[PDB]
Amino acid sequence: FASVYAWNRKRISNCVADYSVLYNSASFSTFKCYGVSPTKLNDLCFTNVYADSFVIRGDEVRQIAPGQTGKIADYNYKLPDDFTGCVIAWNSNNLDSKVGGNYNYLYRLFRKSNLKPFERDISTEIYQAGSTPCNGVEGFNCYFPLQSYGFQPTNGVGYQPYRVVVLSFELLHAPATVCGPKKSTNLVKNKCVNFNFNGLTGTGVLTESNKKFLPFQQFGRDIADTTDAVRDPQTLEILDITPCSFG
């Protein structure tokens, strides 16, 4: 994973996102959704999803939330006050905590001013909570700004490392982007059965055709403009959509 003071930032983009494999994986110790309850994620579409990744203590997962304070949310990673995404977290004691301590994951604890939301600060200038220049070296009332979790495998819960991923769905002003999934059912030809062909909603009997579209045309229309043929997306065969039976 990535440190807590220099988190990562992956910009998930146009694809097919299935937040159900996440939501039901039962391996996550914390799955909170803020802008939007979790079950309705696989039914919405945004412009961009960002995923931020890092590693913190066990009892610091309550500062990854909109409107908190503490050494993590103050100056390591700040979430805006109208957050939209979801926060996921799971214990990782066996991977990150070795025998004797990892001392591989750092975390800033000495800053001048709290972070703006989603702001990042990887500098390493010597602090000076005193009242005298430092020139650039340790001493009294002026210290190095980074500390290290010394993770050990024999640590009580709440001191073992947790890995955190923060998904943030954003909606700028584009034309569209990623979105939930869309299962595909079967096709019963010959029987006035309601149908939906990737957007085309209708009713009627479906029948095997003998017309030939051009290999970019989806459905056919009549004079007076009514849909009368479609192409099945999966098998790519033309089917005549004759209106239902009436009189």
Partner: antibody, heavy 128, light 114 residues
């Protein structure tokens, strides 16, 4: 308490690089400042520099831009590189540290370097 | 930056006597705040790594006998032994620590006689 040991390249031809690794191997470590110190044969001690677990290097201004202390927290080893060796680098080199619990919430930084743990030393000479 | 000067560089102090050492400073210590001036004292036998004796200016730790005793404060420091012993022939250093450039003394040769 842990114990420390070194592994240099015995001799060294002039104007080469110098390779030394000091491997921590003990119980539960509690140190935060790993230092190398230097000693010419039958002369006075001299402090080279340290490295912290926060990656905060610090060097002695008589060997600046000749020393580089690294830190590998996947083997519990740290190391020192003297490039462009000279005839006046004939010394025994120790690695030493302080076995004391570390809290900046109670305590300034220059409280943790009086060199409690000590290595075993390895002779060296810019010979050839 | 800051240097200590160990004046008595050779001592022929036999058994049951006085064994004293001076080490001054080039600046001031004690950190004008609470307490606790910043010295240490190291014993080095030949063919050994040094061992430490004194934590802050006088206080010692488990492992050294109580016959090694530290004194002095401010900028003048002196370590006192227990009339010597059988195996005290060593070289002694007073390391300081005030900011970064950790400096050591010059050495001392606590001999004896026959």
């Amino acid at each position: 308490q842990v114990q420390l040991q070194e592994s240099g390249p015995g001799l060294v031809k002039p104007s080469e690089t110098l390779s030394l690794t000091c491997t921590v191997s003990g119980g539960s470590i509690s140190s935060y400042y790993w230092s190398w110190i230097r000693q010419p044969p039958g002369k006075g001690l001299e402090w080279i520099g340290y490295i912290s677990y926060s990656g905060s290097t610090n060097y002695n201004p008589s060997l600046k831009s000749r020393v580089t202390i690294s830190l590998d927290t996947s083997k519990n080893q740290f190391s020192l590189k003297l490039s462009s060796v000279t005839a006046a680098d004939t010394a025994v080199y120790y690695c030493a540290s302080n076995g004391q619990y570390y809290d900046i919430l109670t305590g300034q930084p220059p409280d943790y370097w009086y060199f409690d743990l000590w290595g075993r030393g390895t002779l060296v000479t810019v010979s050839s | 930056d800051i240097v200590m000067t160990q004046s008595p560089d050779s001592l022929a102090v036999s058994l049951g006597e006085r064994a004293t050492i001076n080490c001054k400073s080039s600046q001031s210590v004690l950190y004008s705040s609470n307490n606790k001036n910043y010295l240490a004292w190291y014993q080095q036998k030949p063919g050994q790594p040094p061992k430490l004796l004194i934590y802050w200016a006088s206080t010692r730790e488990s492992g050294v006998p109580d016959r090694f005793s530290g004194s002095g404060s401010g900028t003048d420091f002196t370590l006192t032994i227990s009339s010597l012993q059988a195996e005290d022939v060593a070289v002694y250093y007073c390391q300081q620590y005030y900011s970064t450039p950790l400096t050591f003394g010059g050495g001392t040769k606590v001999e004896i006689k026959r």
